[PDB]
Amino acid sequence: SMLDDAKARLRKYDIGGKYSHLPYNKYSVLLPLVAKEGKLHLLFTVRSEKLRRAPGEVCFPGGKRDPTDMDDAATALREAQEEVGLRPHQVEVVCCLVPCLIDTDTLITPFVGLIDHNFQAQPNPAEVKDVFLVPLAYFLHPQVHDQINHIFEYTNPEDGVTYQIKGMTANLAVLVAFIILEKKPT
Ligand SMILES: O=C(Cc1cccs1)Nc1cc(B(O)O)cc(C(=O)O)c1
């Protein structure tokens, strides 16, 4: 099946806990995969205009590890629950992708999660202004704007609203699309 085939692809790139004990400032992100209309999509958040860091920009759900978290995957699920109302029984964490090093002292660990078909987002307005889906296949043929920095522009055909996706968020989206969709019969 489409979902079994995705999980089996993703597991080949799992690094597990290999980098999780290093003495960094630690953040986790959830890359949430949603199946709609026969196809896989990624879920993104638009950050609240009131935040200090990157107000109004597109990112994945996630945040800073705290003392209650059993492991880095726990961080990503706690934060997703608080930001968009995703409950733990509504997500299967499939793997841990390569972590991102930033500013010499910070390590961001990405987890890919398969989301329940009946989940419906409840954005927390203090953190999240908007939630939207992008088909995974978009990231193989993106509409690119050069700011030289590559920015993706995605227009949702439901309402005609255009979003900008860039930076680490754009990089991780393309990575997931390659892992799942490369070399497939049609
Ligand atoms: O950035 C996040 C995680 C999110 C990921 C997606 C939307 S929100 N939290 C945050 C930001 C800020 B800020 O930049 O002002 C202050 C806090 C806080 O602990 O108050 C917490």
Ligand SMILES: O=C(Cc1cccs1)Nc1cc(B(O)O)cc(C(=O)O)c1
């Ligand atoms: O999480 C982020 C930025 C992101 C990195 C990964 C995705 S979103 N900020 C943040 C700041 C603070 B703070 O002001 O100390 C507390 C948190 C938190 O999650 O508690 C979170």
